[PDB]
Amino acid sequence: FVNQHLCGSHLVEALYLVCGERGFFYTPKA
Amino acid sequence: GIVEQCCASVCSLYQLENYCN
Ligand SMILES: [Cu+2]
Numbered sequence: 001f002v003n004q005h006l007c008g009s010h011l012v013e014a015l016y017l018v019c020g021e022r023g024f025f026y027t028p029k030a
Numbered sequence: 031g032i033v034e035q036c037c038a039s040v041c042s043l044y045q046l047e048n049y050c051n
Contacts, residue, residue, distance in 0.1 A: 001042065001043045001044070003040040003041065004036060004042065004046075005036070005037070005040050006036040006037060006041065007036070007037035008037070011037065014036075014043070015049055018043050018046045019046075019049070019050035022051050023051040024049045024051060025049055026033070027031060027032075027033065027049070028031070028034070029031055029034055
């Protein structure tokens, strides 16, 4: 696998692919 | 955090696994 530059919605897509049915939390900074 | 690192820098799929439930 390779390193990733992922901003905005592209990071959400990556988390979805990585976690699948386990689900995930998307937790940006304040 | 990860949202920030992945965008301002880079991150790996293995680092993202840390956010799965
Ligand atoms: Cu885009």
